[PDB]
mmCIF file of all heavy atoms in Angstrom:
data_model
loop_
_atom_site.group_PDB
_atom_site.id
_atom_site.type_symbol
_atom_site.label_atom_id
_atom_site.label_comp_id
_atom_site.label_asym_id
_atom_site.label_seq_id
_atom_site.Cartn_x
_atom_site.Cartn_y
_atom_site.Cartn_z
ATOM 1 N N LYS A 1017 -97.119 69.364 -68.218
ATOM 2 C CA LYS A 1017 -98.010 68.384 -67.592
ATOM 3 C C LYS A 1017 -99.244 69.091 -66.926
ATOM 4 O O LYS A 1017 -100.353 68.766 -67.081
ATOM 5 C CB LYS A 1017 -97.307 67.592 -66.479
ATOM 6 C CG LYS A 1017 -98.097 66.618 -65.738
ATOM 7 C CD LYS A 1017 -97.246 65.546 -65.095
ATOM 8 C CE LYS A 1017 -97.843 65.004 -63.735
ATOM 9 N NZ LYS A 1017 -99.313 64.767 -63.789
ATOM 10 N N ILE A 1020 -101.631 70.581 -69.553
ATOM 11 C CA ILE A 1020 -102.771 69.477 -70.079
ATOM 12 C C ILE A 1020 -103.811 69.461 -69.081
ATOM 13 O O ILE A 1020 -104.934 69.593 -69.593
ATOM 14 C CB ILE A 1020 -102.145 68.025 -70.088
ATOM 15 C CG1 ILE A 1020 -100.655 67.960 -70.532
ATOM 16 C CG2 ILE A 1020 -103.029 67.289 -70.799
ATOM 17 C CD1 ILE A 1020 -100.365 67.409 -71.843
ATOM 18 N N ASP A 1021 -103.687 69.389 -67.815
ATOM 19 C CA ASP A 1021 -104.640 69.362 -66.817
ATOM 20 C C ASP A 1021 -105.662 70.592 -67.097
ATOM 21 O O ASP A 1021 -106.839 70.353 -67.199
ATOM 22 C CB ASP A 1021 -104.178 69.350 -65.406
ATOM 23 C CG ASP A 1021 -103.472 67.901 -65.030
ATOM 24 O OD1 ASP A 1021 -103.768 66.944 -65.754
ATOM 25 O OD2 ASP A 1021 -102.792 67.796 -63.982
ATOM 26 N N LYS A 1024 -107.930 70.324 -70.260
ATOM 27 C CA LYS A 1024 -109.058 69.406 -70.027
ATOM 28 C C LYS A 1024 -110.309 70.036 -69.306
ATOM 29 O O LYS A 1024 -111.178 69.336 -68.953
ATOM 30 C CB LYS A 1024 -108.589 68.168 -69.301
ATOM 31 C CG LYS A 1024 -107.801 67.190 -70.022
ATOM 32 C CD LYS A 1024 -107.614 66.079 -69.066
ATOM 33 C CE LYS A 1024 -106.433 65.245 -69.562
ATOM 34 N NZ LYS A 1024 -106.431 63.922 -68.779
ATOM 35 N N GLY A 1037 -92.438 66.873 -77.325
ATOM 36 C CA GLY A 1037 -92.251 65.907 -76.219
ATOM 37 C C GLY A 1037 -93.490 65.656 -75.381
ATOM 38 O O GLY A 1037 -93.503 64.761 -74.527
ATOM 39 N N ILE A 1038 -94.588 66.426 -75.788
ATOM 40 C CA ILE A 1038 -95.690 66.417 -75.043
ATOM 41 C C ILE A 1038 -96.390 64.973 -74.888
ATOM 42 O O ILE A 1038 -96.956 64.758 -73.789
ATOM 43 C CB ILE A 1038 -96.760 67.179 -75.555
ATOM 44 C CG1 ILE A 1038 -97.808 67.648 -74.526
ATOM 45 C CG2 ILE A 1038 -97.421 66.429 -76.826
ATOM 46 C CD1 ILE A 1038 -98.808 68.641 -74.767
ATOM 47 N N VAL A 1039 -95.977 64.068 -75.746
ATOM 48 C CA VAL A 1039 -96.424 62.739 -75.712
ATOM 49 C C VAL A 1039 -95.811 61.912 -74.639
ATOM 50 O O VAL A 1039 -96.121 60.730 -74.505
ATOM 51 C CB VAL A 1039 -96.292 62.160 -77.133
ATOM 52 C CG1 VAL A 1039 -94.861 61.776 -77.324
ATOM 53 C CG2 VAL A 1039 -97.118 60.998 -77.268
ATOM 54 N N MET A 1040 -94.785 62.422 -73.845
ATOM 55 C CA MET A 1040 -94.310 61.789 -72.719
ATOM 56 C C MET A 1040 -95.096 61.910 -71.418
ATOM 57 O O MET A 1040 -94.684 61.245 -70.512
ATOM 58 C CB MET A 1040 -92.801 62.103 -72.561
ATOM 59 C CG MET A 1040 -92.626 63.387 -71.834
ATOM 60 S SD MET A 1040 -90.874 64.071 -71.811
ATOM 61 C CE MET A 1040 -90.046 63.398 -73.200
ATOM 62 N N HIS A 1041 -96.149 62.502 -71.446
ATOM 63 C CA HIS A 1041 -96.979 62.732 -70.234
ATOM 64 C C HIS A 1041 -98.256 61.766 -70.272
ATOM 65 O O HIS A 1041 -99.172 62.019 -71.069
ATOM 66 C CB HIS A 1041 -97.523 64.220 -70.222
ATOM 67 C CG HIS A 1041 -96.455 65.215 -70.213
ATOM 68 N ND1 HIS A 1041 -95.528 65.227 -69.327
ATOM 69 C CD2 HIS A 1041 -96.274 66.216 -71.081
ATOM 70 C CE1 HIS A 1041 -94.612 66.262 -69.616
ATOM 71 N NE2 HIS A 1041 -95.096 66.817 -70.699
ATOM 72 N N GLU A 1042 -98.372 60.886 -69.365
ATOM 73 C CA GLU A 1042 -99.539 59.923 -69.246
ATOM 74 C C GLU A 1042 -100.928 60.653 -69.217
ATOM 75 O O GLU A 1042 -101.881 60.389 -69.814
ATOM 76 C CB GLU A 1042 -99.630 59.064 -68.043
ATOM 77 C CG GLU A 1042 -98.615 57.818 -67.953
ATOM 78 C CD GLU A 1042 -98.658 56.986 -69.334
ATOM 79 O OE1 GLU A 1042 -97.815 57.421 -70.261
ATOM 80 O OE2 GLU A 1042 -99.360 56.005 -69.424
ATOM 81 N N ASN A 1043 -100.828 61.789 -68.510
ATOM 82 C CA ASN A 1043 -101.736 62.797 -68.434
ATOM 83 C C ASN A 1043 -102.523 63.251 -69.770
ATOM 84 O O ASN A 1043 -103.589 63.517 -69.782
ATOM 85 C CB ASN A 1043 -100.833 64.015 -67.958
ATOM 86 C CG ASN A 1043 -101.599 65.064 -67.643
ATOM 87 O OD1 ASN A 1043 -102.904 65.049 -67.505
ATOM 88 N ND2 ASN A 1043 -100.942 66.293 -67.482
ATOM 89 N N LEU A 1044 -101.783 63.082 -70.906
ATOM 90 C CA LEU A 1044 -102.271 63.663 -72.235
ATOM 91 C C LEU A 1044 -103.482 62.750 -72.762
ATOM 92 O O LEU A 1044 -104.358 63.255 -73.409
ATOM 93 C CB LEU A 1044 -101.136 63.550 -73.367
ATOM 94 C CG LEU A 1044 -101.397 63.705 -74.885
ATOM 95 C CD1 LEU A 1044 -101.564 65.183 -75.255
ATOM 96 C CD2 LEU A 1044 -100.351 63.119 -75.702
ATOM 97 N N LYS A 1045 -103.594 61.527 -72.185
ATOM 98 C CA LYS A 1045 -104.764 60.692 -72.318
ATOM 99 C C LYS A 1045 -106.002 61.442 -71.650
ATOM 100 O O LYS A 1045 -105.984 61.621 -70.479
ATOM 101 C CB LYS A 1045 -104.549 59.402 -71.622
ATOM 102 C CG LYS A 1045 -104.876 58.222 -72.393
ATOM 103 C CD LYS A 1045 -104.077 56.938 -71.972
ATOM 104 C CE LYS A 1045 -102.647 56.967 -72.646
ATOM 105 N NZ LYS A 1045 -101.627 57.788 -71.795
ATOM 106 N N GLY A 1046 -106.913 61.706 -72.665
ATOM 107 C CA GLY A 1046 -108.242 62.128 -72.310
ATOM 108 C C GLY A 1046 -108.383 63.651 -72.736
ATOM 109 O O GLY A 1046 -109.517 64.188 -72.618
ATOM 110 N N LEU A 1047 -107.295 64.155 -73.291
ATOM 111 C CA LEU A 1047 -107.438 65.597 -73.648
ATOM 112 C C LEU A 1047 -108.129 65.735 -74.916
ATOM 113 O O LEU A 1047 -108.861 66.669 -75.074
ATOM 114 C CB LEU A 1047 -105.939 66.114 -73.854
ATOM 115 C CG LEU A 1047 -105.919 67.560 -74.290
ATOM 116 C CD1 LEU A 1047 -106.158 68.538 -73.098
ATOM 117 C CD2 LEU A 1047 -104.450 67.867 -74.617
ATOM 118 N N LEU A 1091 -93.667 56.169 -80.254
ATOM 119 C CA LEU A 1091 -94.445 56.684 -79.283
ATOM 120 C C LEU A 1091 -95.609 57.680 -79.798
ATOM 121 O O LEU A 1091 -96.499 57.747 -79.149
ATOM 122 C CB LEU A 1091 -93.482 57.497 -78.231
ATOM 123 C CG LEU A 1091 -93.901 58.252 -76.887
ATOM 124 C CD1 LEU A 1091 -94.938 57.553 -75.889
ATOM 125 C CD2 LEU A 1091 -92.722 58.655 -76.135
ATOM 126 N N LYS A 1094 -98.171 54.919 -81.230
ATOM 127 C CA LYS A 1094 -98.843 54.371 -80.062
ATOM 128 C C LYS A 1094 -99.989 55.345 -79.640
ATOM 129 O O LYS A 1094 -101.139 54.864 -79.577
ATOM 130 C CB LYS A 1094 -97.844 54.211 -78.828
ATOM 131 C CG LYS A 1094 -97.854 52.929 -78.073
ATOM 132 C CD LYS A 1094 -97.296 53.068 -76.736
ATOM 133 C CE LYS A 1094 -98.330 53.080 -75.604
ATOM 134 N NZ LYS A 1094 -98.109 52.014 -74.505
ATOM 135 N N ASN A 1095 -99.653 56.608 -79.361
ATOM 136 C CA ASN A 1095 -100.637 57.488 -78.876
ATOM 137 C C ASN A 1095 -101.510 58.244 -79.718
ATOM 138 O O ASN A 1095 -102.045 59.320 -79.353
ATOM 139 C CB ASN A 1095 -99.757 58.710 -78.178
ATOM 140 C CG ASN A 1095 -99.068 58.323 -76.875
ATOM 141 O OD1 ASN A 1095 -99.505 59.012 -75.887
ATOM 142 N ND2 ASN A 1095 -98.081 57.476 -76.835
#
Side-chain angles (χ1 to χ4, degrees):
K1017 174 159 154 40
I1020 323 251
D1021 287 345
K1024 285 184 196 195
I1038 201 171
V1039 78
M1040 81 192 20
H1041 307 300
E1042 282 317 86
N1043 187 14
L1044 172 78
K1045 226 152 281 87
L1047 183 71
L1091 178 51
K1094 227 198 105 135
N1095 282 248

